[PDB]
């Protein structure tokens, strides 16, 4: 998210705004995203390292 704007700069900003249909990417399921996009169930498990 941008400050004061909330407009996403990246893949999901292409996904939210009707531009892109499906986003198949290493996209982290975090709470900020899932409250305004949908995710399917995860396909890979990882963490901070």
């Amino acid at each position: 998210r941008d400050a004061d704007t909330k407009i996403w700069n990246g893949m999901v900003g292409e996904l939210v705004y009707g531009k892109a249909d499906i986003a198949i990417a290493p996209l982290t399921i975090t709470l900020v995203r899932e409250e305004v996009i949908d995710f399917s169930k995860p396909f890979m498990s990882l963490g901070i390292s």
């Binding site: 292409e14 892109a20 249909d21 499906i22 986003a23």
Partner: peptide, 10 residues
Amino acid sequence: TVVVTTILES
């Protein structure tokens, strides 16, 4: 078709 967006990462 559908739009299948990605990011360029190996």
